[PDB]
Amino acid sequence: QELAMVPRMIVTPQSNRPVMGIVQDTLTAVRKFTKRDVFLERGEVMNLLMFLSTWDGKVPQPAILKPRPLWTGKQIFSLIIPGHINCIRTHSTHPDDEDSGPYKHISPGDTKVVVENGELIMGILCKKSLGTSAGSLVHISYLEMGHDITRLFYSNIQTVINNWLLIEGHTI
């Protein structure tokens, strides 16, 4: 119990990086769930919040109060992120000529993930920011918060994203 339980073996001493990341089906949906234009109604937000195991019990104020209340993908994802962590990554389609000109902190393509004080401010999530690489979001959450909160992080991500994917659907 105190030596080899699976939440105690998230980062490996072989290459000092996590070994468990978000996987085959949840990754594709997490990328689409955090696009700039994903708005949810009231019933769907309630249905999604029903699946959070670490929810305090308050409903956040929508991003668009009028003409009618609509929540955003990043606004719901900001409830899954534990504690108050900080991180800066990039999305896999970041044009390298964006840090040169203006719009360095505006990013027309909605790149340059920024997680400030434990809430997603901007950016799309992908394997560079949620998978098993050094400096990822799961790595930082393990380094700062501990080994018993990253477990809840994984579980909440999976359940919430699956129960939205059966509304959004996916195929080939």
Binding site: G43, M46, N47, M50, F51, G57, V59
Partner: protein, 117 residues
Amino acid sequence: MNAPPAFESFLLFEGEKKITINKDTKVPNACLFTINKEDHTLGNIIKSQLLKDPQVLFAGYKVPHPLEHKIIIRVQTTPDYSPQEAFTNAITDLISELSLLEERFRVAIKDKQEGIE
């Protein structure tokens, strides 16, 4: 035999009780109902009715495991209302809706005993 019989999905056992109340202690005026031997057919019909009440702040349901038979419903209302009130007022509004639709249907099938045309 490592497979459950088919009647376990709807037939109640001896010690079980169909409905159970617990009060949520994290926020005021919240409650958490746990219906037993039930599924999405009844779970979803309730939630849609509670949202139509202008005195309900939260309403949702989940089947915690698709291989067990149990649902959970959470409700939160304004401080001058009771979750147990909002729940039972929802049911009596479904029954008043189904029995009405049955009358309007039985009329429509005998509206063409011989035929309108």
